[PDB]
């Protein structure tokens, strides 16, 4: 999975901004959120979210769902590193295991339960 954010910002600039934001707001985790390719679903105004780390993935679904506003034909799934994170995982734990080398966590969303479908 590829993110547009990674294509628009060079690695060394992401990494330094990531290190800074983790040291300045350690109770949150920096999360890049983008729509998966081929997803037929609503768009999100912003990509960069600072998220309370003790928030579960299920609760993050709630927060993202609200800002998307799902329609009757919709469903909502999260992908991190080609993997649907368990609704029971905390954002902190998810960050721990899956944050990239720029200290950002990258999450894609879709109306299909397979990334890129």
């Amino acid at each position: 999975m590829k993110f547009v954010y990674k294509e628009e910002h060079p690695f060394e600039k992401r990494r330094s901004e990531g290190e800074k934001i983790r040291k300045k707001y350690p109770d949150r985790v920096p999360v890049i959120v983008e729509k998966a390719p081929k997803a037929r679903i609503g768009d999100l105004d912003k990509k960069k979210y600072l998220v309370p780390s003790d928030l579960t993935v299920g609760q993050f679904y709630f927060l993202i769902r609200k800002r998307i506003h799902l329609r009757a034909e919709d469903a909502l799934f999260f992908f991190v590193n080609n993997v649907i994170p368990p609704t029971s995982a905390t954002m902190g734990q998810l960050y721990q295991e899956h944050h990239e080398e720029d200290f950002f966590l990258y999450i894609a969303y879709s109306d299909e339960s397979v990334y890129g479908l």
Partner: peptide, 18 residues
């Protein structure tokens, strides 16, 4: 700041919803 945070109200709801 350049980062988006959810409002107080949104997060408190989420602390309940799941």
């Amino acid at each position: 700041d350049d980062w988006t945070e959810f409002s107080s109200e949104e997060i408190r709801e989420a602390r309940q919803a799941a």
